Design a protein around this nucleic acid. Structure first.
Ligand SMILES: [Mg+2]
Ligand SMILES: [Mg+2]
Ligand SMILES: [Mg+2]
Ligand SMILES: [Mg+2]
Ligand SMILES: [Mg+2]
Ligand SMILES: [Zn+2]
Ligand SMILES: [Zn+2]
Lengths: 33, 49, 100, 36, 67, 183
RNA sequence: ACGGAAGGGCACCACCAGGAGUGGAGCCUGCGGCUUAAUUUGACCAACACGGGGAAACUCACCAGGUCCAGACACAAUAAGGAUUGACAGAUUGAGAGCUCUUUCUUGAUUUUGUGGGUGGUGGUGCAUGGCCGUUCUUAGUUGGUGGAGUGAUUUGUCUGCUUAAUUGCGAUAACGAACGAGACCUUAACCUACUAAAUAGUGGUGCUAGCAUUUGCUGGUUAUCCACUUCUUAGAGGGACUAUCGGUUUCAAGCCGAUGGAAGUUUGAGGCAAUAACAGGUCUGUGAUGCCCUUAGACGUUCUGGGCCGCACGCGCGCUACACUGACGGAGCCAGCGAGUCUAACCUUGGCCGAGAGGUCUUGGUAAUCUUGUGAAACUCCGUCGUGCUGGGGAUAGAGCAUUGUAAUUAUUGCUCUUCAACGAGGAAUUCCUAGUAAGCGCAAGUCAUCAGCUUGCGUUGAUUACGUCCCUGCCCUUUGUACACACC
């Protein structure tokens, strides 16, 4: 549940489904198809 | 694990490169002394005199 | 009628004056009463800094300034003639706040 | 160097959020639960 | 010093080579017509042009000048 | 305040500029107004890309749900070319020729760094008419400095584009020293 | 390109003529040297109050010690009677630190183990870089088209002369015609009794008027008290200066110098932008910028305690106090400017009350031409004490006490009070800055900030001397010249 909470907050950093942009310290995350 | 850092050089960091040195604490920029002079056009700071 | 005071602040003089004159004219053909636009002194936000990203070379400093300026106009109008002129000024770069 | 011994095949207190599984360890005067 | 560059001399000479039955030797009445016979992008540059035309046609009565 | 507020607004425009430069690079980003070279990869799957982008910017800046000739684009494009593999001189020639033939009155592309592993000289490619120090450089010059990161070192690209002052359509229309006579 | 070759020219980073000095004493800072556990590191005109470096924690990369995974991920030897995390009570240690040991409690497919791969590093290389800056350069140089000289590379144009700040021009002339730089341009500081508009500026006049004084005169406040206006102020558009006019000087003129007017006659003053390019100049200690090397769970990463950058036989530079009678000390006059100042919250502080002082307390004004602020600043000026002495200049050093800032003031952070009052009697060879609101004297605002100026960036106030030039000193530019250099005198 400790990861289910964030994975349902969404709608892991390396497996996929994640684009990481830094842009002054704010770790811009987005999902992929 | 963390002692209080609400003031001093370590309290605030540069919003651009996380540098604790050369920070300009003026007008609410919080941008380092090189980063601001680099990205001065995007804030509107320009040279005329 | 309700009394309002609009304040216009911006960095770009051309569009700031376009707004400051558009509001005056569009009150004019609608026949309102207003005291002329008061021109508060321009604030130069001079920021001194070091040209060198380090401490080598002759001591040379770099001075920036972001000239910001501002005008205010007070008048009276009903709510329709306030909102229909408040929604005219959408020019990017000039911010206007209306106090009642 | 925490070991966490295997604890091979083998009551309750206040703060009822614990589900009756906080059996104390009988060393001495041990009326204090593991949580606290 | 007070030396006039090519951007002044060439423009003054170009004005004079086609505007002799035209602007007189008074700077005030030279600049006003330079306003509409030249698309000068600067007031002080226009004033320089008018002043050098004034000098040139002030001396032109003492003999022709080259160029 | 208002002074601090507008300074923060300029900083906010700075984060938008840099974030779109880093994120929208592959789609031809030019400048925050979004101004992109092509506006179909912006829309993506009929709004998915724009929806996720606006969601990210809103969540970052704490907002509610609803609240060709540019040197920057040319530099990004040629950075992409040099990164995917192309002769540096050929890419600079192509960019310079495109800029100069597309109505621009002058271009300069400067490549500094280790082109081939060496003492890292800096080679220029200049074509047309070029202006330097004075208010005209602010009026009509577009400049872009980008860092290419290939397998060896860093390559610094400086691109300068001059739009034609005659077609200024705003501000001065000729050079300060430009004089035109009619008779 | 270079030369320990020559000629012209330029410059208060050179001088002549000068002013302020500095080097002479003390203190503050930086560097060196020394010392240390570290006294971190980089830098030697163009380093040495520089890395906006005024370091108690952090900053910090240095040291004496102690924790943390913040080791992603397809991946294998670990699983559904248990892969792992967490722990108060005691030894441990600075630690209420489950960091380690007695120790048995909790949760349950995250983690942890062995291989692979990432990650960070203020770890190294500025002689691997990008970028940025500094220097050449507070210098004026650079290049096509056509034509001309050569077989040619190339050369003229781009110059003997004069002028300029300028390759700025005039002029001469196989050159003409131009292009970038300079100039032009832009910002600001000067003025405009003019256009426009102002309870966020001011002035006139009425009540609301207290005083002086009463023939209505002076001065004051009347923050919802009244109208008018822009002379003061503000800022948009424009104007004005263009060495204007006139003389002398000019080779032929560019130009120069005088006098007049002008608001302003040195590019009107000061600046921003500053081309062709070159440095192994500096910066990997800004970047989640980066190549390479090193390290990565006994970590050069991160985090906590403490220490360190400050440390002292000695030299040097940036600065202050002065070394007194133009001074020192008491009172009194209250005369600026550029800015800055808090709504998720603690900033700029006015006004009362307390205290000798710093400072505290109750609020108020201020998100600002609105309140601090009219920054009631200093130097300065009036009247008095001191009367030429190591004196009453000087405040170094040290002792005692009170508070603010700060989790934490000891190696005094800082502020204040009292108290022995040290060198210095104007400075050595030398050496730095500078030509008019300039130097110098003075303090103010901001930056560095929780606090701390002697620092720097801007400002204003008082405000001179001498010069209106030269290449003798230094450095640079151009031309000529020599080269056996071409990676170019490393
Ligand atoms: Mg210029
Ligand atoms: Mg470290
Ligand atoms: Mg030549
Ligand atoms: Mg130090
Ligand atoms: Mg300092
Ligand atoms: Zn930064
Ligand atoms: Zn429990």
């Amino acid at each position: 549940e400790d990861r289910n909470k964030i994975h349902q907050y969404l709608f892991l950093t390396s497996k996929g489904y994640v684009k990481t942009q830094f842009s002054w310290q704010y770790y811009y995350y987005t999902l992929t198809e | 694990f963390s002692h209080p850092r609400r003031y001093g050089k370590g309290s605030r960091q540069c919003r651009v490169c996380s540098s604790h040195t050369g920070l300009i604490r003026k007008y609410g920029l919080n941008i380092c002394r090189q980063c601001f002079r680099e990205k001065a056009n995007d804030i509107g700071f320009n040279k005329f005199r | 009628i309700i009394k309002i005071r609009i304040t216009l602040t911006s960095t770009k003089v051309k569009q700031l004056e376009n707004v400051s004159s558009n509001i005056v004219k569009n009150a004019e053909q609608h026949n309102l009463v207003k005291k002329g636009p008061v021109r508060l002194p321009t604030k130069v936000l001079k920021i001194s800094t070091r040209k060198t990203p380090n401490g080598e070379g002759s001591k040379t400093w770099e001075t920036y300034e972001m000239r910001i300026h501002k005008r205010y106009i007070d008048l009276e109008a009903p709510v329709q003639i306030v909102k229909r002129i408040t929604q005219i000024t959408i020019e990017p770069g000039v911010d206007v706040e209306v106090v009642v | 160097k925490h070991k966490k011994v295997k604890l091979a095949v083998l009551r309750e207190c206040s703060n009822p959020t614990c589900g009756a599984g906080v059996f104390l360890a009988n060393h001495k005067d041990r009326l204090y639960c593991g949580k606290c | 010093g007070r030396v006039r560059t090519k951007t002044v001399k060439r423009a003054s000479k170009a004005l004079i080579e086609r505007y002799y039955p035209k602007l007189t030797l008074d700077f005030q009445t030279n600049k006003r017509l330079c306003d509409e016979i030249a698309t000068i992008q600067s007031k002080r540059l226009r004033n320089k042009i008018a002043g050098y035309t004034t000098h040139l046609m002030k001396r032109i009565q003492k003999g022709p000048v080259r160029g | 305040s208002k002074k601090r507020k507008l300074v923060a607004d300029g900083v906010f425009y700075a984060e938008l500029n840099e974030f779109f430069t880093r994120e929208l690079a592959e789609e031809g980003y030019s400048g925050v107004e979004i101004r992109a070279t092509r506006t179909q990869d912006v829309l993506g799957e009929n709004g998915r890309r724009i929806n996720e982008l606006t969601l990210l910017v809103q969540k970052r800046f704490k907002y509610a749900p609803g609240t060709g000739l540019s040197a920057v684009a040319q530099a990004e494009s040629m950075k992409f070319k040099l990164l995917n593999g192309l002769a540096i001189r050929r890419a600079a020639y192509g960019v310079v020729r495109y800029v100069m033939e597309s109505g621009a009155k002058g271009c300069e592309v400067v490549v500094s760094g280790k082109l081939r592993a060496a003492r890292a000289k800096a080679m220029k490619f200049a074509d047309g008419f070029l202006i330097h120090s004075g208010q005209p450089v602010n009026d009509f010059i577009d400049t872009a400095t980008r860092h290419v990161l290939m397998r060896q070192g860093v390559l610094g690209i400086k691109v300068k584009i001059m739009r034609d002052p005659a077609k200024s359509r705003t501000g001065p229309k000729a050079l300060p020293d430009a004089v035109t006579i009619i008779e």
